[PDB]
Structures are given as C-alpha cells and as structure tokens.
Structure 1
Amino acid sequence: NAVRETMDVLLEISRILNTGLDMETLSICVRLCEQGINPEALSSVIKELRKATEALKAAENMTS
C-alpha cells in the first residue's frame, strides 16, 4: 500500500506537471529505477517511444 500511495502521489505530481504519464508506466519506471536505470535514459526513451507511438497511431488512423 505504501508503494501504491507513493505511485499515486507521484502520478498526481506528474499530472500537475502535465506529463500524461500512465500508472502502469509509473510502476514500470519504479521497477527500472530500483533496477538501476538512468532517469535521463528512461525519460529520453519514453519521449522517443511516445513519438513513435504517436506516429504509428497517425499512420494506422490513415491505414483504417
């Protein structure tokens, strides 16, 4: 419950930051950070993957 509450507070902060980050992404990021993943690497990969997902979504919308 402590991890869940911490994740909820972090998600609230991120929503205040207007990041549009998911709770599942938050949990995955918590696991990566405890695993020793660079916050900069995680955020850069997140931005690149968000851009790729947006491009794929646009392409599939034109691909319907």
Structure 2
Amino acid sequence: NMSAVRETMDVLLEISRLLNTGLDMETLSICVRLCEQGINPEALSSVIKELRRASDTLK
C-alpha cells in the first residue's frame, strides 16, 4: 500500500516538474488529498496564486 501511493505520487511529481512548479513534494501531496475530498479545480488554483503573491510582498 505504502509502495503504491509512493508510485502514484511519483508520477504526478514528474508531471509537475516538467510543467515547472514552485510547490514542493509535501505541498503537492496535500493538493491531491484535497482533490480526492471534493473541491472544484478552479478554487484551488486561485487560492494558490493569491497566497504565492502575498508571500513575495512579505519577503
């Protein structure tokens, strides 16, 4: 089971990297868990962009 989830992650992780992402592996894991738990794809995409932007203004 442990092996299977790793491979599921592993493939998605490869795709995220090709497309270029700023998310790490930990965050990416969280997103999937949200996907499974419902949550239309546009709301998730938006909350991310606003949070990414606010972090740059702060730092």
TM-score normalised to structure 1 length? 0.76
1:27 to 23, 26, 29: 29
Kindly indicate whether residue 35 of structure 2 is the aligned counterpart of residue 40 of structure 1.
no
Equivalent pair of 1:14/1:20 in contact (CA under 8 Å): no
Give the structure with higher Rg (CA). Answer: 1
Task: For residues 23-57 of structure 1, give each alpha carbon's deviation from its aligned partner in whole angstroms, at most 9, with x where no partner exists.
Answer: 11111111111110121111111111111112111
Q: Distance in 2 between matches of 1:56 and 1:3?
A: 35
Unpaired runs of 5+ residues, structure 2, are: none
Report matched runs for 1:1-64 at 5 Å: 1-57=3-59
Aligned pairs, number = 57
Deviation at 1:20, TM superposition (A): 2.1
AA matched with 1:20: G
> After the TM superposition, which parts of structure 1 deviate over 4 Å for at least 4 consecutive aligned residues?
none
Q: Which protein has greater RCO, CA pairs closer than 8 Å, 6+ apart? A: 2
Unaligned 5+ segments in structure 1 are: 58-64
